[PDB]
Swiss-Prot record:
Protein name: Host translation inhibitor nsp1
Role: Inhibits host translation by interacting with the 40S ribosomal subunit. The nsp1-40S ribosome complex further induces an endonucleolytic cleavage near the 5'UTR of host mRNAs, targeting them for degradation. Viral mRNAs are not susceptible to nsp1-mediated endonucleolytic RNA cleavage thanks to the presence of a 5'-end leader sequence and are therefore protected from degradation. By suppressing host gene expression, nsp1 facilitates efficient viral gene expression in infected cells and evasion from host immune response. May disrupt nuclear pore function by binding and displacing host NUP93.
UniProt organism field: Severe acute respiratory syndrome coronavirus
Residues covered by the CoV Nsp1 globular domain: 1-116
Full protein: residues contained: 12 to 127 of 7073
Outcome of swapping residue 71 to C: In strain: Isolate GD01
């Protein structure tokens, strides 16, 4: 189940603007909406990445809400200020950014929770 969705994958060094906003719930909402528009892209979480983003790093984690093994890499939209949790984990599949033409190197599919 869930909706299937794709995004581009951009370099954090081309993505001049990696903030959707400057609070958690802001960036989470705007992310959901830049996804709804389709003007979002993905940035992979690597060791030097957080202290180049703004702050409310809109993460994707592989849906810790289930107990089954048989599926695609499903994820869900989440956000943290210091990246206290999630970003500093191995769940976590990247951080979203507003796509402004930064030239992708790749694309990253996921599914997207839709209750009804």
């Amino acid at each position: 189940g869930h909706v299937q969705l794709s995004l581009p994958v951009l370099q954090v060094r081309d993505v001049l603007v990696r903030g959707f906003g400057d609070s958690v719930e802001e960036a989470l909402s705007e992310a959901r909406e830049h996804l709804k528009n389709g003007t979002c892209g993905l940035v992979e979480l690597e060791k030097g990445v957080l202290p180049q983003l703004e702050q409310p790093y809109v993460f994707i984690k592989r849906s810790d809400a289930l107990s089954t093994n048989h599926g695609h890499k499903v994820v869900e939209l989440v956000a943290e200020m210091d990246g206290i949790q999630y970003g500093r984990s191995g769940i976590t599949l990247g951080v979203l950014v507003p796509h402004v033409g930064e030239t992708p190197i790749a694309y990253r599919n996921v599914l997207l929770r839709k209750n009804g």
